[PDB]
Amino acid sequence: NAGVTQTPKFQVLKTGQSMTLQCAQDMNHNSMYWYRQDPGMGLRLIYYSASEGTTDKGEVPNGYNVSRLNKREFSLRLESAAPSQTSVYFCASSVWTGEGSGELFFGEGSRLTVLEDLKNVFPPEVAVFEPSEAEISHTQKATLVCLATGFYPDHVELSWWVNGKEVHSGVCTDPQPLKEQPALNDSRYALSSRLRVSATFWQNPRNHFRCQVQFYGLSENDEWTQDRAKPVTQIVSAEAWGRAD
Template identity: 45%
Template sequence: MHRSDCDGDQTLLSPRTPLWTTKRLCVWPAINVNRGEAYFGQGTKLTVLGSVLYFGKGTKVSVIEDGLNITEPNVALFDPSPHEVKERRSATLVCLAAKFYPDHVVLSWSVNGVERTEGVKTDDHPTRGSDKMYSLSSRLRLSKKEWLNPQTTFRCKVYFDPTKQNIIKETRGREGCGGVTTESFRKSANTAKFTYVLLITKSAFYGLLVTLIAWKIKLHGGKHFS
């Protein structure tokens, strides 16, 4: 990379000096720079030699650091803790995207296929570890009633821009007090049906018994007066 016309208080970027941003971006020659891919999207991000610059809207550029490769995130989805569900009457799902590089990810939630933004709290930006890889976490807070329904599907989707891949993890609600399940509904329906049939049968039996007793009394009374 070469230096452009830089005079006065212009921007200077080199391996030996800090970063300043004013009117123009100037890049000094650098040694052992790995020329990587450039990604363009909303907002601008320039990464050079491990440093990051933000400016304007419309462009995001990353220069892959020497010795690092584009790596897709490992994504894990963690269910709410039983203690939270029991004591706080709420449920928090946690989605973790880890060990990815560079930090070009978008994380989103959906419930039964519908995107969910209410109750979502995602880290402001990915965190970089000592291994130079990034991680990002997000939390989805639910009501206890919504979590205790196995018919509900919760999905965390992480879009990794460098490879244009969606990594998806999902889980389903759990059975519990207050939850409605297919099995419990079926059992309740069968029980109600059996009870209804039993009551109808008993009513018919008692009606027949009363009719029989009344007929016998009438028959016995007729014989007595004759």
């Protein structure tokens, strides 16, 4: 009872590189679909499969192919990736096609960025900044801030870890990254997040705070020729301890 499972969640590609997105549904559905979502416009259908054993083109099939492997699986193939195929791809399924009221069930989405060269891919630099003493005395609260800066593309997942456990209460992360150089088209990004706790929780010297950014980047098969380090998929983190005085 997992619903719709598509992989991978993120992927960087060089122009001309092949790629296959996977999609599976365990709801015994007959119809499956592949969409792309781009800013400023509605979902556009790429290919669909009305039932097992048949597929057809959607609105934007050029540059893609699909295979309805069986009733559960519907893969999307990018043979020669192009910069215009940089998008968020969604696989969906429905019980049938042509039934009027049947809704779609969507997978988590796959974010693809296709680049001419991988020389502008950077992992984030991550830093934690401890609360202001003025805030603690004025509000009896303490706000930690975390900055992930200089990363490209925008394939990151930031999380907070208090005493080894991930937390979400008192946490707010920018929903959209910040272009460090808004004019340039391939600008590296910055992302900020805050964790706010009570002053008493911050003033316990044995409380541990950690910011963690998962970056999705290159893999073993990607060619790297730059003098800097290869920007592979990696976790970059920074920490801070509670301060008594």
